[PDB]
RNA sequence: AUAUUGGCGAGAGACCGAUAGCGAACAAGUACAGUGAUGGAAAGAUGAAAAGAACUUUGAAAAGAGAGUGAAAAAGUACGU
RNA sequence: CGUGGAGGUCAGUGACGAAGCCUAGACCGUAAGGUCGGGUCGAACGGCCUCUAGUGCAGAUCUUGGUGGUAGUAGCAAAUAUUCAAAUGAGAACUUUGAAGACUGAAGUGGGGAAAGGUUCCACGUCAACAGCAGUUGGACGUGGGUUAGUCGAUCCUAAGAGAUGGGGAAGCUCCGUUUCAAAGGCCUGAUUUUAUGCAGGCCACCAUCGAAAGGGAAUCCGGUUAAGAUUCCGGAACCUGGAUAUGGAUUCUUCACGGUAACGUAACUGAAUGUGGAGACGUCGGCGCGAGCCCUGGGAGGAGUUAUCUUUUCUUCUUAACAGCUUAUCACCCCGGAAUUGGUUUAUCCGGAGAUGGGGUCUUAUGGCUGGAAGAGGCCAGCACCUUUGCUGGCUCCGGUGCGCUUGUGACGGCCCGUGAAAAUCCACAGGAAGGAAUAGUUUUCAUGCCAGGUCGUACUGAUAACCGCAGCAGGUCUCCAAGGUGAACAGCCUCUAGUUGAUAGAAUAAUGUAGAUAAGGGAAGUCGGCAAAAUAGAUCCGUAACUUCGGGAUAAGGAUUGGCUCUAAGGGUCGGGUCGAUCAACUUAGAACUGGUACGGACAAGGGGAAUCUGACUGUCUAAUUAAAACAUAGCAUUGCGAUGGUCAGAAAGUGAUGUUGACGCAAU
RNA sequence: CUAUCUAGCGAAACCACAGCCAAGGGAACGGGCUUGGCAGAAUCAGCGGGGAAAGAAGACCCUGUUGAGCUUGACUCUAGU
RNA sequence: UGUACAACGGGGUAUUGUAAGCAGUAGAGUAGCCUUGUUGUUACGAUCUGCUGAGAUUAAGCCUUUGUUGUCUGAUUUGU
RNA sequence: AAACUUUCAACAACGGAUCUCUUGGUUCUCGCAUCGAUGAAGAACGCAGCGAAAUGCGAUACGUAAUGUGAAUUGCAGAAUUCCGUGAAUCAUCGAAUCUUUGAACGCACAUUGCGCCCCUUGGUAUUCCAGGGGGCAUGCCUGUUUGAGCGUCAU
């Protein structure tokens, strides 16, 4: 049977865990995630994939650093001791 | 499995810490708008896949 | 826990996961001032670590988890 | 205490993975895990079997003395007694025939 | 040797015990009404299936 | 001088008004499906104020009937009409 | 006429109730539609002149959402089967306990595990939802507890393979290749502490790395213990590795042992660079031998059961770990000797002047025995006390036998091959003889004893007719280990012990038609496309068996008879005195004869229908997972074609690029 | 064992409105129309004539200035050699 | 509250085929005794014979009874 | 005749339309130019007195320091006049710090919480062994320093 009986035999995966994007997509019979080609150095994304490009791209996550580029140009990237 | 490595007994213990209710004092909040947990899982229902 | 305790020269403690029953052995060496002798870790599955440690004798954890205080 | 167990979580019965059932002071079975047995060491040239050497395997021939390991000859614990035999009247008999075309 | 349990953790933090079964069973409750809305409004496009065979011919 | 459906900050509209308008007015790229690429939702409104129904009684209990709060329970969290 | 919004206007209506909604209540208009009253309800909305559009729905197998009739209907019917009383509780066909009955029937409904799942494990509390009925129950809900490793595994090695560097290609994301056309590198003495190097003093020419929880591999066992963990914990007893180091012993003043004819031995007994060898390291089948565990069985010490009668009876406990010391063998080998009248020899036909037989010895130590561990543990029984803690006391825990038995391991051999049945880490030894060393002294850390340490991650549970996948608590599917008695050839089927379950929605009734299973007078394929389906035959022993034939088969050909039970006889072996006969132990197998019965007897289970001919494909084998298993495909065999490497066939975008090719015409490739 | 009756549980296909016939005519075979025959609540188990019964925007045929797989000495070109 | 009904029991009828138990001087033949026996005798021994056309079952959709025991006013609806 | 079926109304139900609302979108316009090897974007894990999320944050962990404000947070408990003050606060501001494991990701590798090497230091009798703490080890390229190679080449 190609149907209920062989969904029996699927036990074995061909997908974990990516160390970089942390979803099941790292082949592992070559080494190389589907949705951010990890050993690559650059992230996979493709301009057809318009809404993947809105599901990792920038202002998805915490932005540690990045939030606060405004708070300091505005300011004037000054440094030193804050005031009286 | 039984054998098993530790990301992925790490990801089951952040899985059983969130395999809990909602805390009642919660819905005692002045402007409220959770009433449960929705993001709640059972390894009945839906299967996690890691 | 607190039957090893008893029955036992056991104490159970939490420990940090990045701890590695060497520098267990020496905290208790040193907080406690107790000679330990055998170190047995484990990790429980909400994520955190634990640690049974077994004092030598001429040193009863009874007497050292009042000197603490959760008996 | 029949029908035993597996001990370790090899469940397949390879070569690695053998059992012998014992009957404990408990007076029940319980499997324990032999391990692979130990060839003899075998000679350079004829290629036969050593006779003083002990059959271990190789990392325990380091936890062993130098007489479970040799014989008291000159090749002995890699070569057998007759071929050494052989490798003896060759060379004397080689070395004097050349001593013989000489004078 | 024993003094605390979750009980008399929650009695601090607000709610006590039949407060909690009230607010247990509107929350169970609430639970329930959206599995029905959702067995609902799955039950159309839950039997669509995408390659069924058929058997019959003849 | 020019460009600018991106980012930061501002101002407005003969625009949509919760099946509309961004897929998302809400813990939405969330839950969930798929091996994977990818796909991808639903769901806003008690009332001015919780005052969210003390107390009595039948009931195994839910709950009910009386009482009571309220301007109004023909607003009782399954709550605007 | 009407709708959403815009500009003007009625100094428009309105919390003394706007809008909206219901109204077989009213009025106007041909009509689209407008207005009014009532009820409901609670905050904004209209008329008029004009502007402007996402502007008017019965429809599109329309989109989304929701709701009906059919319908309290079909139907909840495989998996042999449930019943009585009590306890609990609001409530019991379904929970718990007890008694009964029965099932899986050791290729299991048992006990564990790999993938996978992920806390489903255990407890306390609980029933709104889930358990297609119920539910006081639960793999559910709520709260919590829970997974202890120097020895198990990963980790380390490498296989098929993957993949950077240098380089070369490519517009480029990136590709080739994996030691290649690279200046690819550490490691040790003097120099004695400057340890930077003068020489040293030379060592292949290597040269990433990843890759197996089933291959390779350093080392562990018993008992006990928990709600749930344990080769991890407690107790006891051991071992390995890496390091330190001190005594004892050994050896040496002629510095680095001694014996033995020899195979070889021992508590030990320097040995560098380099080189070499071995183990690691290997198919499959068959029978033979040996062992372990199990099965069977005798005697005895204890306990339980039956007993109207019989039963020296039926059941059951009587155990001994890793590790360690001593001894223990098939093969092989050494010494003495010198074989045809050829002998020795296995189930199996090999072996000997290249030295058999024979006499005497050496080693391997799988394995076995004895002792230590280890009886003190565990088990069986009796006895005295107590909620303290649950304890205390006493006794026994012994001696055997048997085998084509079962599983398994292992050895010596044999057969099979145009098939000859992984590598590497790692460990050891040997050859060689560098350098070094002594007298209370030096080497000995491969002799014995002694000291220290042994990290990180996994470890619960199921492993499936409820824990995985199949939309699900699906009759499907998914790797493997252990494996009792009887019947019998048999792990078949049938019954049973240990262990486990007794779960699947139930009750009552017994109509048609059905599903599954059976019977049938007389005839016997007339039915039918057609003997589809079903039946008959079926096992073992003896007799007897054709044409045809590639001489191997056909063949269980066909075709006949027998088969139980009971009482007997005989032959088949081993011991010990008789055979250049006797007492005794232990066997399951064969043949025969009587007697006997309602002529029955492979008594249930199990278990071939046969024959004559034609068409076709040689055979075994393979495919259309889910309509076609076939005469198709394949096959061996036959033939043909190209190609002598600057090559044939094929590849790649390209390349200092690749498959065949670890190849070479008895080959590769194409038909 | 079901079906059947009962306690509990409880869907689906399908559905213009629906559901007695004959003849007539008619899109040439009506459940409805016309003329006649007839006609009495509510209904259970069965049945398989009928509802040109349900399933599926016929698959055969044809048309389309719609395509695809395949072949060749079709037209136009092409890797390679 | 009766020649009433039922549960049992009894009798008939019917089917099967001669029960358990006891006895035997039956019983091929083997093992023990002593006379060595036209059954000599004892033990086992399927089976055979007698009690025994016994025993078993017999209305559940058979017949009969005159024995034992027991039962016999619960609910609903209905009017020219 | 009632049941039943149908129609209408009232009340109640199922269901969530309409009306009103709107911290949301969409579109137009104006201004600004500001990521990262000083380790970005993104990911995994974890952090609160009681939180699963969202938001914030990193073992200094819904945050510390500093500046301004000048008495709250509030679901509960806890704090409490420090409240005519170097001072509350999930405040605002933000110029000092922290910033786990990662990621271009940088010692090697990574389906492993795997394996190394150098320096300083401590402990264990220890330059060598084991362990702990702190700091470093990527590649290409440039400028420069140092060392070295090549009968390429000069003078001696
Ligand atoms: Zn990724
Ligand atoms: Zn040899």
Redesign the pocket.
């Known amino acids: 049977?190609?149907?209920?009986?062989?969904?029996?035999?699927?036990?074995?995966?061909?997908?974990?865990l990516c160390?970089?994007?942390?979803?099941?997509?790292?082949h592992?019979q070559?080494?190389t995630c589907?949705?951010c080609?990890?050993?690559?150095?650059?992230?996979?994304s493709?301009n057809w994939?318009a809404?993947?490009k809105?599901?990792?791209?920038?202002?998805?996550?915490?932005?540690?650093?990045?939030?606060?580029?405004?708070?300091?140009?505005?300011?004037g990237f000054?440094?030193?001791?804050?005031?009286? | 499995?039984?054998?098993?490595?530790?990301?992925?007994?790490?990801?089951?213990?952040?899985?059983?810490?969130?395999?809990?209710?909602?805390?009642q004092?919660?819905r005692?909040?002045?402007?409220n708008?959770?009433?449960?947990?929705?993001?709640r899982?059972?390894?009945?229902?839906?299967?996690?896949?890691? | 826990?607190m039957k090893?305790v008893e029955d036992?020269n056991?104490l159970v403690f939490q420990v940090?996961?990045?701890?590695?029953?060497?520098?267990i052995?020496?905290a208790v060496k040193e907080l406690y001032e107790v000679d330990v002798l055998?170190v047995?870790?484990?990790?429980?599955?909400n994520?955190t670590?634990?640690a049974?440690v077994?004092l030598t004798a001429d040193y009863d954890a009874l007497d050292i988890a009042n000197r603490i205080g959760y008996i | 205490a029949?029908?035993?167990?597996?001990?370790?979580?090899?469940?397949?019965?390879?070569?690695?993975?053998?059992?012998?059932?014992?009957?404990?002071?408990?007076?029940?079975?319980?499997a324990?895990?032999?391990?692979?047995?130990?060839?003899?060491?075998?000679?350079?040239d004829c290629?036969?079997?050593?006779?003083?050497?002990?059959?271990?395997?190789?990392?325990?021939?380091?936890?062993?003395?130098?007489?479970?390991?040799?014989?008291?000859?000159?090749?002995?614990?890699?070569?057998?007694?007759?071929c050494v035999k052989e490798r003896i009247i060759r060379a004397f008999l080689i070395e004097e025939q050349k001593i013989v075309k000489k004078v | 040797r024993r003094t605390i349990?979750?009980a008399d953790?929650?009695m601090?933090?607000?709610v006590t015990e039949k407060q909690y079964k009230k607010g247990?069973?509107?929350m169970?409750?609430?639970e329930?009404?959206?599995?029905n809305?959702?067995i609902?409004?799955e039950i159309?496009?839950?039997?669509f299936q995408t390659h069924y065979?058929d058997?019959?011919?003849?």
């Open positions: 049977g190609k149907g209920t009986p062989s969904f029996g035999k699927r036990h074995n995966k061909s997908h974990t160390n970089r994007c942390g979803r099941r997509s790292f592992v070559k080494k589907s949705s080609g990890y050993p690559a150095a650059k992230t996979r493709y994939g809404k993947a809105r599901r990792h791209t920038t202002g998805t996550g915490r932005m540690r650093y990045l939030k606060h580029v405004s708070r300091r140009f505005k300011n000054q440094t030193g001791s804050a005031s009286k | 499995a039984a054998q098993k490595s530790f990301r992925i007994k790490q990801k089951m213990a952040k899985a059983k810490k969130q395999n809990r209710p909602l805390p004092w919660i005692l909040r002045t402007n708008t959770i009433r449960y947990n929705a993001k899982r059972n390894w009945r229902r839906t299967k996690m896949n890691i | 826990a090893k036992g056991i940090s996961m990045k701890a590695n029953k060497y520098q052995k020496k055998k047995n870790t484990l990790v429980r599955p994520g670590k634990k049974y077994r | 029949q029908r035993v167990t597996f001990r370790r979580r090899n469940p397949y019965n390879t070569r690695s993975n053998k059992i012998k059932v014992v009957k404990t002071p408990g007076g029940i079975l319980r324990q895990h032999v391990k692979k047995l130990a060839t003899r060491p075998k000679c350079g290629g036969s079997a050593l006779q003083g050497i002990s059959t271990l395997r190789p990392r325990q021939y380091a936890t062993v003395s130098k007489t479970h390991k040799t014989v008291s000859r000159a090749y002995g614990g890699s070569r057998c007694a007759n | 349990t979750a953790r929650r601090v933090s607000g247990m069973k509107k169970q409750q609430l329930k009404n959206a599995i809305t959702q609902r409004r159309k496009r839950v039997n065979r058997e019959l011919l003849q």
